[PDB]
Swiss-Prot record, chains A, B:
This antigen is a pathogen-specific membrane immunogen. It comes from Treponema pallidum (strain Nichols). The chain holds residues 48 to 204 of 204 of the full protein. The keyword Transcription does not apply. It is a lipid-anchor. This is 34 kDa membrane antigen. Keywords: Cell membrane, Lipoprotein, Membrane, Palmitate, Signal. One of its GO terms (cellular component) is plasma membrane. Belongs to the UPF0423 family. It is found in: Cell membrane.
């Protein structure tokens, strides 16, 4: 089972969903994420183009690759913030941005914020000529999708 | 308007098409590719998952991101080979890999080869747990789509 972090958000050209479920094993194991055994769960950000995404050239529903996605978790009652760097990966059901996560502050209700940066100038381009190009341009400040009352009560699996 | 490089190829889990048309302006201008004015044409590699791609977790027909695509162009009867690193980008028709290029030995018949490497070790992962993961793996030797008799007969525009 997948469990929602909250209701899907539309922000700019992106439709953004968040879900969590059991920790997974990834190859290669990304960055500094906890192993399947060490982690509390896996959290994924599903990011697909919405209608406004067409101005950048995307088809509506297309996965949007080359983004840099980071999550920030803050337990209600705490001033501590945990930063989670998501990584691009495929599961059985396709390309996602995801991470194994261990909640440093434990059980409780959290504010969960996804900050989504556009592809680096070095890593992606847009056709901009009249004939073949697109009208839109990538966003400069990261797009934000946030849920304010995410309840972490331990594994639901 | 797009012109064909040759017949579409299926290689491993990828369906690969090659087209060319007038040089384009890109933002930012990628790597060391020629400008719109300096180039002879823009060449695109259109790469989507085929049925064998479903084992890697891709939706069949999905664009396959994070690949490293390099084109080699060699005029018939010549020992000179041009190496062109393609860049990921969007045009009005969506994400693809491509480049502005010059045909450096002028008009005539060229061998055109796309070598397609899987994502860098640190750029992508697969879920591999039995529960959420996939049973396929990335290819180790780059995949090759090639056309032995592409005719560069100059701008068709
Ligand atoms: Co939705
Ligand atoms: Co939407
Ligand atoms: Co999903
Ligand atoms: Co994942
Ligand atoms: Co820019
Ligand atoms: Co292009
Ligand atoms: Co590997």
């Amino acid at each position: 089972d997948e469990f929602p972090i909250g209701e899907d958000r539309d922000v700019g050209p992106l439709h953004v969903g968040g879900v969590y479920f059991q920790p997974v094993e990834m190859h290669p194991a990304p960055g500094a994420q906890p192993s399947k055994e060490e982690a509390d769960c896996h959290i994924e950000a599903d990011i697909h183009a919405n209608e406004a995404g067409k101005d950048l050239g995307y088809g509506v529903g297309d996965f949007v690759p080359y983004l840099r996605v980071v999550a920030f978790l803050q337990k209600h009652g705490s001033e501590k913030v945990q930063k989670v760097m998501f990584a691009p990966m495929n599961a059985g059901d396709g390309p996602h941005y995801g991470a194994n996560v261990k909640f440093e502050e434990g059980l409780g209700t959290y504010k969960v914020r996804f900050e989504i940066a556009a592809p680096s100038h070095d890593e992606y381009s847009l056709h901009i000529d009249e004939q073949t190009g697109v009208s839109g341009r990538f966003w400069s400040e990261p797009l934000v999708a946030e849920w304010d009352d995410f309840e972490w009560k331990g594994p639901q699996w």
